[PDB]
Write a protein that holds these residues in place. Structure first.
Motif, short mmCIF file in Angstrom:
data_model
loop_
_atom_site.label_atom_id
_atom_site.label_comp_id
_atom_site.label_asym_id
_atom_site.label_seq_id
_atom_site.Cartn_x
_atom_site.Cartn_y
_atom_site.Cartn_z
N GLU A 283 0.88 -1.10 0.03
CA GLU A 283 0.20 -0.01 0.00
C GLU A 283 0.89 1.35 -0.09
N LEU A 284 1.88 1.15 0.68
CA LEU A 284 2.88 2.22 0.92
C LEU A 284 3.74 2.51 -0.32
N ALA A 285 4.25 1.31 -0.82
CA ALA A 285 4.92 1.41 -2.22
C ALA A 285 4.41 2.06 -3.27
N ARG A 286 3.10 1.84 -3.61
CA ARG A 286 2.23 2.33 -4.59
C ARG A 286 2.05 4.06 -4.34
N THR A 287 1.73 4.03 -2.91
CA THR A 287 1.54 5.57 -2.64
C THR A 287 2.59 6.49 -2.79
N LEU A 288 3.93 5.80 -2.38
CA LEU A 288 5.17 6.62 -2.53
C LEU A 288 5.32 6.79 -4.03
N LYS A 289 5.06 5.60 -4.94
CA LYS A 289 5.34 5.93 -6.50
C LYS A 289 4.53 6.97 -6.85
N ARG A 290 3.12 6.93 -6.56
CA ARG A 290 2.17 8.02 -7.00
C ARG A 290 2.68 9.28 -6.63
N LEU A 291 3.30 9.52 -5.52
CA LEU A 291 3.83 10.81 -5.00
C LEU A 291 5.17 11.27 -5.64
N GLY A 292 5.50 10.46 -6.36
CA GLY A 292 6.73 10.80 -7.46
C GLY A 292 7.96 10.53 -6.45
N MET A 293 8.26 9.52 -5.82
CA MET A 293 9.32 9.20 -4.91
C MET A 293 10.46 8.19 -5.94
N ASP A 294 9.84 7.50 -6.74
CA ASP A 294 10.51 6.61 -7.56
C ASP A 294 11.78 7.20 -8.30
N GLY A 295 13.09 7.27 -7.95
CA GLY A 295 14.00 7.78 -8.81
C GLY A 295 14.21 9.17 -8.28
N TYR A 296 13.74 9.82 -7.05
CA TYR A 296 13.91 10.95 -6.84
C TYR A 296 15.38 11.23 -6.14
N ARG A 297 16.05 12.01 -7.03
CA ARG A 297 17.43 12.58 -6.81
C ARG A 297 18.27 11.27 -6.78
N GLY A 298 17.87 10.41 -7.45
CA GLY A 298 18.62 9.00 -7.95
C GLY A 298 18.36 8.03 -6.61
N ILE A 299 17.17 8.30 -6.24
CA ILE A 299 16.79 7.25 -4.86
C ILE A 299 15.68 6.39 -5.56
#
Length: 130
Positions: free
Chosen positions: A7-23
């Motif tokens: 649930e958290l994984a998809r939430t963070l993805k939707r919030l644009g966290m995937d690959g943010y500043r190389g993270i």
């Protein structure tokens, strides 16, 4: 609120966290897991320096959010620490993005270094569809 892994994984993805500043998302997942156990109301008082870590990402009151009681504090993220204890993590994410815009990056959290750095972190996002 205590998030379930995927649930958290998809939430963070939707919030644009995937690959943010190389993270990678997996690294953000590993971080939240060890800092709070995916718990948005977690707080940790540091008796040593009189500061407190707030929320899912355990954001510090000395530099990122303002709680009024932390000595020599500054508010880099420019948020009340109260905002980081909500069930909606939009603000905590925005603050986490601010933290990693500094040169240290994800390394600003010692716990990430201790349990996430140079390890297989795929386990945190496996099967989540994110």
């Amino acid at each position: 609120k205590v998030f379930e892994r995927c649930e958290l994984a998809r939430t963070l993805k939707r919030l644009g966290m995937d690959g943010y500043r190389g993270i990678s998302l997996a690294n953000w997942m590993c971080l939240a897991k060890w800092e709070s156990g995916y718990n948005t109301r977690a707080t940790n008082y540091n008796a040593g320096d009189r500061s407190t870590d707030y929320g899912i990402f355990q954001i510090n009151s000395r530099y990122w959010c303002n709680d009024g009681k932390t000595p020599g504090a500054v508010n880099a993220a420019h948020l009340s620490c109260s905002a980081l204890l909500q069930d909606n993590i939009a603000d905590a994410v925005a603050a986490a993005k601010r933290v990693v815009r500094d040169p240290q990056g994800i390394r600003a959290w010692v716990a990430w270094r201790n349990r996430c750095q140079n390890r297989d972190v795929r386990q945190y996002v496996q099967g989540c569809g994110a």
